[PDB]
Amino acid sequence: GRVIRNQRKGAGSIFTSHTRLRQGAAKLRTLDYAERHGYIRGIVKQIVHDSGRGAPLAKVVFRDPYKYRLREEIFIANEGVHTGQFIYAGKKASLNVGNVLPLGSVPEGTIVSNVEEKPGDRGALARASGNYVIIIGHNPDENKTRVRLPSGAKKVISSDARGVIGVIAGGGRVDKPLLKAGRAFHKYRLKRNSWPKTRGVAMNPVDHPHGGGNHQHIGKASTISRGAVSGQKAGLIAARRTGLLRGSQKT
Amino acid sequence: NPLTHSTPKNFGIGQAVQPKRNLSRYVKWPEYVRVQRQKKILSIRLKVPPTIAQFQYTLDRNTAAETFKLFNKYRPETAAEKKERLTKEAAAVAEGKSKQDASPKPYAVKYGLNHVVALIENKKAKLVLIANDVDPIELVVFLPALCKKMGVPYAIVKGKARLGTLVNQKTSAVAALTEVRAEDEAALAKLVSTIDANFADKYDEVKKHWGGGILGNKAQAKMDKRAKNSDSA
Amino acid sequence: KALKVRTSATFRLPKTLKLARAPKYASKAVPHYNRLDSYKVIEQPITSETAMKKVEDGNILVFQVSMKANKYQIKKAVKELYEVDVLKVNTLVRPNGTKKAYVRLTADYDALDIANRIGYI
Amino acid sequence: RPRQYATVSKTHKTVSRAYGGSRCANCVKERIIRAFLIEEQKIVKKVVKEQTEAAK
RNA sequence: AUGGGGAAGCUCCGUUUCAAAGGCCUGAUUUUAUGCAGGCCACCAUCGAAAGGGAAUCCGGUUAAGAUUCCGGAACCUGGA
RNA sequence: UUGUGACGGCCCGUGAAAAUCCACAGGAAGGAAUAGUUUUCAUGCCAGGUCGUACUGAUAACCGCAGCAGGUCUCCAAGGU
RNA sequence: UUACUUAUUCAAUGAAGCGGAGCUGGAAUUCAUUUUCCACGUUCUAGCAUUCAAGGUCCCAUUCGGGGCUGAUCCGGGUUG
């Protein structure tokens, strides 16, 4: 046969992301001294559109504690953050929307966003628009905070991991129909070359496991083993079940 | 006085630019510096078998000073003195046709690892000083055992550079006296008594004693805290 | 033995002493003579009808010039060869691959005078 | 043009006010007012904190 | 490219990474040199556009054939005590 | 027709850069009386190298075996209906 | 189901505050043998925060002004997780 499209997507030639219009990586302030012993006050200079990102970004300016310098950070804006607002990042920062408290400092039921997976990685979880993390609970000995992730997953992470308070701005985005191949085209034109999607069943057998036949049919089961290989993993990978499901997420 | 004010800068966690504190504890040291420090640290952390760590048992400063003073009195002859001696022997064999023995028998400290090891094997060596800084330890790690076998007093001393200065080099790694003058034979015997008291008779204990196994400052504090909260009942 | 105060946590390569070269022999042992001298940058005049009209009317000498020569060297070489003061030099590279210079002299000097001095009318 | 700014005189590129050629007049006024008022409030806050601690 | 790490190797990766990564002013500027407690420090090679960004020129005349380039007149920019 | 201006729609699309040039808080460095400050005000001095530049750009100057009804990017754009 | 870190492994930073140390006062189970945290001037404002730092302590052979301590605690040199 032939190397199939999902195989070709890994060589990263035409499938690299279109990063021209982007405003920089949206990362928290580095965990230096003030973020873990006190707080530091920065100012939201502007809230901007980042191409490919559904959530607005916040350009927050902080003072350098050791040098006469202004350090600009690129935050993921939460709902309600505005220009001219003061952001307080640190262990002693208050439970206000836009502040970057540690999970140990925030109490249970807190709505946090841009939560660090490990302390100091500058934000990994709940970064897409409208998304948030629930602080389920704490465990002070061997300090670990249990949190609920946007997918409903339980995660035990360090009590030192930072996170902004609130929900990510730009929510409700997927509630609007695109209505147009043109709108999909413009959506993906600045994300990556992943659109349009030809159906594998409409290809030839050289091009896909599903291609070929005198009728457009998959032929064999479309559920593929986790132990399958590249070129085989086309369909429903390691599916526990299939078909329409009668239920809700239930976290 | 009327024109001067009180500024004081508040160096709180978010108030004023921090002053130029000494950041020597946080320097990004070069790779070779880091390897030096970490090599020493790893050698300390690992349980070093008794064959090593019988070194780093160097004799104390006072007796080291006496021993190196005696050896410096027994120091070899410089190049200028060697040329003088050779010229005087040339003149002697020219005028009296002497049998090259007008010059007295020398009394010098024997150096060179192979030379000194052969001297110990032959039991010629009165006293042998073994440095502790030799980069491959296997060069001298067998020397205490050899000296114990041959009954020659040995002392692990501090400084291959010191031994090199002693024998007019940069590094000797070993020194030895095989013959002495009567004027300081008594001094050498007194020195040998204490050197043997430290090394030759405690040899079996030194060969049973295991070194190393020391943890870092934070680790010591951690086990201290754990023991304190365990026995605090 | 105490340490030194390291205000910055950055280690930089120390400024070690930089010696100056003191060679034990000369590299080429004889300095090459002037490659582009006045007789090398000024090859020969150009005596076309157009060039002679330039000499007669525009007070401009026309020359074939060394390809490696620039306007500075052309100016200097014309000055040193023909003892004239030149106003402007405009060069081009001809489609046959040679440098052609139009050297306009000052009002003090006559291009036709200097052309008759060189030898071509 | 930015390179044309180099040839002109200094009086064409600024205003006689403080922050002249960099900030607006209303910006400078707002910053003066804010600076004075916040520093006065800092003095008042320091005094009230000191006096409540002395009472305590 | 380098530092580094792969590969038997032709070479591959990597582009600031687990690297000790450099350049402008007066004092020094002659019984003594660019040596020196003289200062600021920390772009983090380079290549890549004759349609992107960009210092500055116009008119008249002139040739068989060149001209915003030559000539006449009138300007502008950049760099230099 | 072109340029400019104030505007108003559109986007789950909001239309990235860099060199370079100015400006802004600071007074670190100077003097008051035949001079001490100004080359960001006017006037005056000098220089500006290197390479391209002709012509066609197409039912004949390019590619298609050719002076081939093919292909090949762009600017200017009169009057009447 | 575990403990150690020093091999190996994963991240961050310009390797800046890590691990243990105390005046006056606080929570004040402490049977006068101190176990842990704060006042170590950061939260109404789109302001400012840089010149070995002002102030404070003993002296300089005086003309650019200073020097040590302190401001800014000590110990361990494991950058930190």
mmCIF file of N, CA and C (backbone and C1' of nucleotides) in Angstrom, chain G residues 23-68:
data_model
loop_
_atom_site.group_PDB
_atom_site.id
_atom_site.type_symbol
_atom_site.label_atom_id
_atom_site.label_comp_id
_atom_site.label_asym_id
_atom_site.label_seq_id
_atom_site.Cartn_x
_atom_site.Cartn_y
_atom_site.Cartn_z
ATOM 1 P P C G 23 15.960 35.715 71.492
ATOM 2 O "O5'" C G 23 16.408 37.190 71.081
ATOM 3 C "C5'" C G 23 15.447 38.198 70.788
ATOM 4 C "C4'" C G 23 15.997 39.580 71.042
ATOM 5 C "C3'" C G 23 15.081 40.531 71.796
ATOM 6 O "O3'" C G 23 15.085 40.320 73.197
ATOM 7 C "C1'" C G 23 15.969 41.645 69.918
ATOM 8 P P U G 24 13.726 40.475 74.042
ATOM 9 O "O5'" U G 24 13.277 41.983 73.792
ATOM 10 C "C5'" U G 24 12.517 42.689 74.764
ATOM 11 C "C4'" U G 24 11.468 43.566 74.127
ATOM 12 C "C3'" U G 24 10.079 42.959 73.988
ATOM 13 O "O3'" U G 24 9.318 42.996 75.183
ATOM 14 C "C1'" U G 24 10.698 43.934 71.939
ATOM 15 P P G G 25 8.413 41.733 75.602
ATOM 16 O "O5'" G G 25 7.184 41.772 74.586
ATOM 17 C "C5'" G G 25 6.035 42.560 74.861
ATOM 18 C "C4'" G G 25 5.042 42.518 73.724
ATOM 19 C "C3'" G G 25 4.390 41.171 73.447
ATOM 20 O "O3'" G G 25 3.293 40.906 74.305
ATOM 21 C "C1'" G G 25 5.140 42.123 71.416
ATOM 22 P P G G 26 2.838 39.394 74.607
ATOM 23 O "O5'" G G 26 1.994 38.974 73.322
ATOM 24 C "C5'" G G 26 0.733 39.568 73.051
ATOM 25 C "C4'" G G 26 0.183 39.114 71.722
ATOM 26 C "C3'" G G 26 -0.168 37.637 71.617
ATOM 27 O "O3'" G G 26 -1.460 37.354 72.126
ATOM 28 C "C1'" G G 26 1.099 38.297 69.727
ATOM 29 P P A G 27 -1.685 36.135 73.145
ATOM 30 O "O5'" A G 27 -2.195 34.944 72.217
ATOM 31 C "C5'" A G 27 -3.333 35.099 71.378
ATOM 32 C "C4'" A G 27 -3.412 33.990 70.359
ATOM 33 C "C3'" A G 27 -3.402 32.576 70.924
ATOM 34 O "O3'" A G 27 -4.691 32.123 71.314
ATOM 35 C "C1'" A G 27 -1.818 32.748 69.163
ATOM 36 P P A G 28 -5.348 32.558 72.718
ATOM 37 O "O5'" A G 28 -4.110 32.932 73.649
ATOM 38 C "C5'" A G 28 -3.461 31.941 74.431
ATOM 39 C "C4'" A G 28 -2.020 31.791 74.018
ATOM 40 C "C3'" A G 28 -1.209 30.734 74.755
ATOM 41 O "O3'" A G 28 -1.377 29.423 74.230
ATOM 42 C "C1'" A G 28 -0.014 32.761 74.746
ATOM 43 P P U G 29 -2.363 28.359 74.934
ATOM 44 O "O5'" U G 29 -1.424 27.452 75.853
ATOM 45 C "C5'" U G 29 -1.606 26.034 75.897
ATOM 46 C "C4'" U G 29 -0.597 25.330 76.773
ATOM 47 C "C3'" U G 29 0.066 24.107 76.133
ATOM 48 O "O3'" U G 29 1.417 24.012 76.591
ATOM 49 C "C1'" U G 29 -1.027 23.449 78.111
ATOM 50 P P U G 30 2.430 22.945 75.938
ATOM 51 O "O5'" U G 30 3.816 23.723 75.810
ATOM 52 C "C5'" U G 30 4.121 24.842 76.636
ATOM 53 C "C4'" U G 30 4.811 24.431 77.913
ATOM 54 C "C3'" U G 30 3.875 24.026 79.049
ATOM 55 O "O3'" U G 30 4.506 23.021 79.840
ATOM 56 C "C1'" U G 30 5.173 25.877 79.726
ATOM 57 P P C G 31 3.716 21.672 80.211
ATOM 58 O "O5'" C G 31 3.758 21.634 81.802
ATOM 59 C "C5'" C G 31 4.993 21.493 82.496
ATOM 60 C "C4'" C G 31 5.126 22.510 83.602
ATOM 61 C "C3'" C G 31 6.179 22.185 84.658
ATOM 62 O "O3'" C G 31 6.734 23.398 85.165
ATOM 63 C "C1'" C G 31 4.050 22.298 85.677
ATOM 64 P P A G 32 8.301 23.704 84.991
ATOM 65 O "O5'" A G 32 8.417 25.274 85.234
ATOM 66 C "C5'" A G 32 9.596 25.838 85.800
ATOM 67 C "C4'" A G 32 10.462 26.486 84.749
ATOM 68 C "C3'" A G 32 11.827 26.972 85.232
ATOM 69 O "O3'" A G 32 12.774 26.827 84.175
ATOM 70 C "C1'" A G 32 10.602 28.797 84.374
ATOM 71 P P U G 33 14.341 26.704 84.500
ATOM 72 O "O5'" U G 33 14.968 26.125 83.154
ATOM 73 C "C5'" U G 33 14.822 24.753 82.806
ATOM 74 C "C4'" U G 33 15.209 24.501 81.368
ATOM 75 C "C3'" U G 33 14.179 24.937 80.325
ATOM 76 O "O3'" U G 33 14.859 25.383 79.153
ATOM 77 C "C1'" U G 33 14.586 22.624 80.110
ATOM 78 P P U G 34 14.639 26.878 78.608
ATOM 79 O "O5'" U G 34 13.510 26.716 77.496
ATOM 80 C "C5'" U G 34 13.826 26.231 76.194
ATOM 81 C "C4'" U G 34 12.637 25.566 75.544
ATOM 82 C "C3'" U G 34 12.598 25.654 74.022
ATOM 83 O "O3'" U G 34 11.987 24.482 73.482
ATOM 84 C "C1'" U G 34 10.707 26.757 74.933
ATOM 85 P P U G 35 12.770 23.595 72.393
ATOM 86 O "O5'" U G 35 11.617 23.002 71.465
ATOM 87 C "C5'" U G 35 11.153 23.712 70.325
ATOM 88 C "C4'" U G 35 9.979 23.013 69.685
ATOM 89 C "C3'" U G 35 9.200 23.817 68.656
ATOM 90 O "O3'" U G 35 9.803 23.775 67.374
ATOM 91 C "C1'" U G 35 7.701 22.749 70.157
ATOM 92 P P U G 36 10.227 25.132 66.628
ATOM 93 O "O5'" U G 36 8.944 25.515 65.765
ATOM 94 C "C5'" U G 36 8.462 24.648 64.747
ATOM 95 C "C4'" U G 36 7.110 25.087 64.246
ATOM 96 C "C3'" U G 36 7.012 26.539 63.802
ATOM 97 O "O3'" U G 36 7.456 26.719 62.469
ATOM 98 C "C1'" U G 36 5.191 26.012 65.229
ATOM 99 P P C G 37 7.649 28.190 61.857
ATOM 100 O "O5'" C G 37 6.238 28.520 61.194
ATOM 101 C "C5'" C G 37 6.021 29.753 60.526
ATOM 102 C "C4'" C G 37 4.687 30.355 60.892
ATOM 103 C "C3'" C G 37 4.650 31.874 60.949
ATOM 104 O "O3'" C G 37 4.476 32.462 59.672
ATOM 105 C "C1'" C G 37 3.634 30.982 62.893
ATOM 106 P P C G 38 5.276 33.799 59.282
ATOM 107 O "O5'" C G 38 4.126 34.871 59.033
ATOM 108 C "C5'" C G 38 4.395 36.258 59.146
ATOM 109 C "C4'" C G 38 3.583 36.881 60.252
ATOM 110 C "C3'" C G 38 3.990 38.284 60.667
ATOM 111 O "O3'" C G 38 3.514 39.289 59.792
ATOM 112 C "C1'" C G 38 3.690 36.962 62.593
ATOM 113 P P A G 39 4.543 40.360 59.181
ATOM 114 O "O5'" A G 39 4.572 41.531 60.262
ATOM 115 C "C5'" A G 39 3.427 42.337 60.492
ATOM 116 C "C4'" A G 39 3.663 43.338 61.595
ATOM 117 C "C3'" A G 39 5.015 44.033 61.593
ATOM 118 O "O3'" A G 39 5.107 45.091 60.653
ATOM 119 C "C1'" A G 39 4.551 43.271 63.767
ATOM 120 P P C G 40 6.546 45.639 60.183
ATOM 121 O "O5'" C G 40 6.880 44.815 58.857
ATOM 122 C "C5'" C G 40 7.102 43.409 58.889
ATOM 123 C "C4'" C G 40 8.533 43.073 59.232
ATOM 124 C "C3'" C G 40 9.540 43.153 58.094
ATOM 125 O "O3'" C G 40 9.984 44.478 57.860
ATOM 126 C "C1'" C G 40 9.880 41.159 59.345
ATOM 127 P P G G 41 9.643 45.225 56.481
ATOM 128 O "O5'" G G 41 8.215 45.882 56.742
ATOM 129 C "C5'" G G 41 7.433 46.392 55.668
ATOM 130 C "C4'" G G 41 6.001 46.630 56.079
ATOM 131 C "C3'" G G 41 5.111 47.228 54.994
ATOM 132 O "O3'" G G 41 3.780 46.731 55.141
ATOM 133 C "C1'" G G 41 5.176 48.687 56.845
ATOM 134 P P U G 42 3.321 45.393 54.375
ATOM 135 O "O5'" U G 42 2.527 45.925 53.099
ATOM 136 C "C5'" U G 42 3.044 46.979 52.299
ATOM 137 C "C4'" U G 42 2.751 46.771 50.835
ATOM 138 C "C3'" U G 42 1.415 46.131 50.504
ATOM 139 O "O3'" U G 42 0.335 47.042 50.581
ATOM 140 C "C1'" U G 42 3.124 45.153 49.188
ATOM 141 P P U G 43 -1.053 46.595 51.254
ATOM 142 O "O5'" U G 43 -1.919 46.075 50.024
ATOM 143 C "C5'" U G 43 -2.021 46.845 48.832
ATOM 144 C "C4'" U G 43 -3.424 46.833 48.273
ATOM 145 C "C3'" U G 43 -4.546 46.809 49.310
ATOM 146 O "O3'" U G 43 -5.643 47.584 48.830
ATOM 147 C "C1'" U G 43 -4.756 44.949 47.877
ATOM 148 P P C G 44 -5.818 49.111 49.294
ATOM 149 O "O5'" C G 44 -7.017 49.648 48.394
ATOM 150 C "C5'" C G 44 -8.207 48.888 48.251
ATOM 151 C "C4'" C G 44 -9.183 49.534 47.299
ATOM 152 C "C3'" C G 44 -8.610 50.057 45.991
ATOM 153 O "O3'" C G 44 -8.423 49.026 45.037
ATOM 154 C "C1'" C G 44 -10.184 51.603 46.902
ATOM 155 P P U G 45 -7.270 49.140 43.927
ATOM 156 O "O5'" U G 45 -7.761 50.322 42.980
ATOM 157 C "C5'" U G 45 -6.941 50.773 41.911
ATOM 158 C "C4'" U G 45 -7.481 52.021 41.261
ATOM 159 C "C3'" U G 45 -6.517 52.690 40.283
ATOM 160 O "O3'" U G 45 -7.247 53.266 39.200
ATOM 161 C "C1'" U G 45 -7.064 54.207 42.001
ATOM 162 P P A G 46 -7.455 52.445 37.834
ATOM 163 O "O5'" A G 46 -6.015 52.440 37.152
ATOM 164 C "C5'" A G 46 -5.018 51.492 37.531
ATOM 165 C "C4'" A G 46 -3.815 51.538 36.622
ATOM 166 C "C3'" A G 46 -3.224 52.924 36.382
ATOM 167 O "O3'" A G 46 -1.813 52.810 36.206
ATOM 168 C "C1'" A G 46 -3.936 52.001 34.329
ATOM 169 P P G G 47 -0.855 52.559 37.470
ATOM 170 O "O5'" G G 47 0.205 53.744 37.390
ATOM 171 C "C5'" G G 47 -0.011 54.860 36.539
ATOM 172 C "C4'" G G 47 0.746 56.075 37.015
ATOM 173 C "C3'" G G 47 2.190 55.840 37.428
ATOM 174 O "O3'" G G 47 3.076 55.794 36.322
ATOM 175 C "C1'" G G 47 1.102 57.148 39.066
ATOM 176 P P C G 48 4.299 54.752 36.303
ATOM 177 O "O5'" C G 48 5.266 55.282 37.448
ATOM 178 C "C5'" C G 48 5.871 56.562 37.355
ATOM 179 C "C4'" C G 48 6.713 56.848 38.569
ATOM 180 C "C3'" C G 48 7.689 55.750 38.953
ATOM 181 O "O3'" C G 48 8.885 55.792 38.198
ATOM 182 C "C1'" C G 48 6.515 56.467 40.872
ATOM 183 P P A G 49 9.675 54.437 37.859
ATOM 184 O "O5'" A G 49 10.228 53.953 39.273
ATOM 185 C "C5'" A G 49 11.157 54.751 39.998
ATOM 186 C "C4'" A G 49 11.140 54.447 41.478
ATOM 187 C "C3'" A G 49 12.034 53.292 41.920
ATOM 188 O "O3'" A G 49 12.517 53.570 43.231
ATOM 189 C "C1'" A G 49 9.809 52.824 42.519
ATOM 190 P P U G 50 14.056 53.957 43.455
ATOM 191 O "O5'" U G 50 14.801 53.208 42.268
ATOM 192 C "C5'" U G 50 16.209 53.068 42.278
ATOM 193 C "C4'" U G 50 16.690 52.289 41.084
ATOM 194 C "C3'" U G 50 18.133 52.532 40.682
ATOM 195 O "O3'" U G 50 19.050 51.797 41.468
ATOM 196 C "C1'" U G 50 16.756 52.624 38.767
ATOM 197 P P U G 51 19.845 52.519 42.661
ATOM 198 O "O5'" U G 51 21.241 52.911 42.010
ATOM 199 C "C5'" U G 51 21.976 54.020 42.511
ATOM 200 C "C4'" U G 51 23.188 54.323 41.669
ATOM 201 C "C3'" U G 51 24.117 55.384 42.254
ATOM 202 O "O3'" U G 51 25.467 55.068 41.927
ATOM 203 C "C1'" U G 51 23.357 56.088 40.138
ATOM 204 P P C G 52 26.523 54.784 43.102
ATOM 205 O "O5'" C G 52 25.908 53.537 43.877
ATOM 206 C "C5'" C G 52 25.800 52.267 43.252
ATOM 207 C "C4'" C G 52 26.440 51.193 44.093
ATOM 208 C "C3'" C G 52 26.033 51.170 45.558
ATOM 209 O "O3'" C G 52 24.794 50.519 45.782
ATOM 210 C "C1'" C G 52 28.383 51.035 45.400
ATOM 211 P P A G 53 23.948 50.824 47.114
ATOM 212 O "O5'" A G 53 22.719 51.699 46.606
ATOM 213 C "C5'" A G 53 22.921 52.987 46.034
ATOM 214 C "C4'" A G 53 22.118 54.048 46.747
ATOM 215 C "C3'" A G 53 22.907 54.916 47.725
ATOM 216 O "O3'" A G 53 22.340 56.224 47.746
ATOM 217 C "C1'" A G 53 21.194 53.790 48.887
ATOM 218 P P A G 54 23.269 57.507 48.005
ATOM 219 O "O5'" A G 54 22.406 58.410 48.994
ATOM 220 C "C5'" A G 54 22.386 58.153 50.390
ATOM 221 C "C4'" A G 54 21.096 58.620 51.016
ATOM 222 C "C3'" A G 54 21.146 58.922 52.509
ATOM 223 O "O3'" A G 54 21.599 60.236 52.788
ATOM 224 C "C1'" A G 54 19.326 57.499 52.066
ATOM 225 P P G G 55 22.652 60.510 53.970
ATOM 226 O "O5'" G G 55 21.893 60.034 55.284
ATOM 227 C "C5'" G G 55 20.746 60.723 55.758
ATOM 228 C "C4'" G G 55 20.043 59.931 56.830
ATOM 229 C "C3'" G G 55 20.894 59.564 58.034
ATOM 230 O "O3'" G G 55 20.996 60.611 58.982
ATOM 231 C "C1'" G G 55 19.754 57.644 57.270
ATOM 232 P P G G 56 22.402 60.905 59.703
ATOM 233 O "O5'" G G 56 22.658 59.604 60.584
ATOM 234 C "C5'" G G 56 21.786 59.269 61.654
ATOM 235 C "C4'" G G 56 22.136 57.939 62.272
ATOM 236 C "C3'" G G 56 23.573 57.766 62.733
ATOM 237 O "O3'" G G 56 23.823 58.374 63.988
ATOM 238 C "C1'" G G 56 22.881 55.839 61.550
ATOM 239 P P U G 57 25.318 58.793 64.406
ATOM 240 O "O5'" U G 57 25.990 57.424 64.867
ATOM 241 C "C5'" U G 57 26.874 57.373 65.981
ATOM 242 C "C4'" U G 57 27.908 56.287 65.815
ATOM 243 C "C3'" U G 57 29.291 56.752 65.377
ATOM 244 O "O3'" U G 57 30.100 57.146 66.474
ATOM 245 C "C1'" U G 57 28.586 54.941 64.017
ATOM 246 P P C G 58 30.672 58.643 66.582
ATOM 247 O "O5'" C G 58 32.244 58.477 66.371
ATOM 248 C "C5'" C G 58 33.047 57.767 67.305
ATOM 249 C "C4'" C G 58 34.319 57.272 66.665
ATOM 250 C "C3'" C G 58 35.124 58.318 65.906
ATOM 251 O "O3'" C G 58 35.975 59.071 66.757
ATOM 252 C "C1'" C G 58 34.840 56.402 64.545
ATOM 253 P P C G 59 36.677 60.418 66.230
ATOM 254 O "O5'" C G 59 38.065 59.916 65.634
ATOM 255 C "C5'" C G 59 38.800 60.719 64.723
ATOM 256 C "C4'" C G 59 39.412 59.883 63.629
ATOM 257 C "C3'" C G 59 39.686 60.610 62.321
ATOM 258 O "O3'" C G 59 40.901 61.342 62.338
ATOM 259 C "C1'" C G 59 38.534 58.605 61.862
ATOM 260 P P C G 60 41.014 62.756 61.580
ATOM 261 O "O5'" C G 60 41.592 62.374 60.147
ATOM 262 C "C5'" C G 60 42.672 61.456 60.020
ATOM 263 C "C4'" C G 60 42.713 60.826 58.650
ATOM 264 C "C3'" C G 60 43.188 61.749 57.531
ATOM 265 O "O3'" C G 60 43.900 60.995 56.551
ATOM 266 C "C1'" C G 60 40.964 61.051 57.095
ATOM 267 P P A G 61 45.298 61.546 55.981
ATOM 268 O "O5'" A G 61 44.870 62.533 54.805
ATOM 269 C "C5'" A G 61 45.807 63.443 54.239
ATOM 270 C "C4'" A G 61 45.436 64.877 54.531
ATOM 271 C "C3'" A G 61 46.488 65.911 54.141
ATOM 272 O "O3'" A G 61 45.845 67.117 53.734
ATOM 273 C "C1'" A G 61 46.109 66.010 56.476
ATOM 274 P P U G 62 45.703 67.462 52.171
ATOM 275 O "O5'" U G 62 44.179 67.901 52.015
ATOM 276 C "C5'" U G 62 43.583 68.028 50.728
ATOM 277 C "C4'" U G 62 42.184 68.588 50.812
ATOM 278 C "C3'" U G 62 42.070 69.967 51.459
ATOM 279 O "O3'" U G 62 41.036 70.712 50.820
ATOM 280 C "C1'" U G 62 40.778 68.404 52.683
ATOM 281 P P U G 63 41.365 72.142 50.166
ATOM 282 O "O5'" U G 63 40.537 72.140 48.806
ATOM 283 C "C5'" U G 63 39.118 72.026 48.817
ATOM 284 C "C4'" U G 63 38.616 71.243 47.628
ATOM 285 C "C3'" U G 63 38.557 69.731 47.822
ATOM 286 O "O3'" U G 63 37.471 69.203 47.061
ATOM 287 C "C1'" U G 63 40.036 70.240 46.050
ATOM 288 P P C G 64 36.632 67.941 47.597
ATOM 289 O "O5'" C G 64 35.741 67.524 46.342
ATOM 290 C "C5'" C G 64 36.307 67.506 45.035
ATOM 291 C "C4'" C G 64 35.324 67.055 43.980
ATOM 292 C "C3'" C G 64 34.667 65.703 44.239
ATOM 293 O "O3'" C G 64 33.365 65.680 43.648
ATOM 294 C "C1'" C G 64 35.974 65.577 42.272
ATOM 295 P P G G 65 32.044 65.779 44.562
ATOM 296 O "O5'" G G 65 32.124 64.504 45.513
ATOM 297 C "C5'" G G 65 32.385 64.653 46.900
ATOM 298 C "C4'" G G 65 33.756 64.137 47.249
ATOM 299 C "C3'" G G 65 33.852 62.669 47.618
ATOM 300 O "O3'" G G 65 33.803 61.799 46.502
ATOM 301 C "C1'" G G 65 35.110 63.941 49.148
ATOM 302 P P G G 66 33.117 60.356 46.668
ATOM 303 O "O5'" G G 66 33.127 60.132 48.244
ATOM 304 C "C5'" G G 66 33.215 58.831 48.799
ATOM 305 C "C4'" G G 66 34.491 58.654 49.581
ATOM 306 C "C3'" G G 66 34.623 57.348 50.344
ATOM 307 O "O3'" G G 66 35.055 56.290 49.512
ATOM 308 C "C1'" G G 66 35.276 59.161 51.727
ATOM 309 P P G G 67 34.341 54.856 49.591
ATOM 310 O "O5'" G G 67 35.113 54.123 50.774
ATOM 311 C "C5'" G G 67 36.531 54.124 50.822
ATOM 312 C "C4'" G G 67 37.039 53.640 52.156
ATOM 313 C "C3'" G G 67 36.194 52.587 52.852
ATOM 314 O "O3'" G G 67 36.351 51.285 52.322
ATOM 315 C "C1'" G G 67 36.800 54.242 54.408
ATOM 316 P P G G 68 35.078 50.306 52.243
ATOM 317 O "O5'" G G 68 34.897 49.787 53.738
ATOM 318 C "C5'" G G 68 35.772 48.806 54.273
ATOM 319 C "C4'" G G 68 35.517 48.557 55.739
ATOM 320 C "C3'" G G 68 34.126 48.071 56.113
ATOM 321 O "O3'" G G 68 33.934 46.687 55.886
ATOM 322 C "C1'" G G 68 34.772 49.795 57.582
#
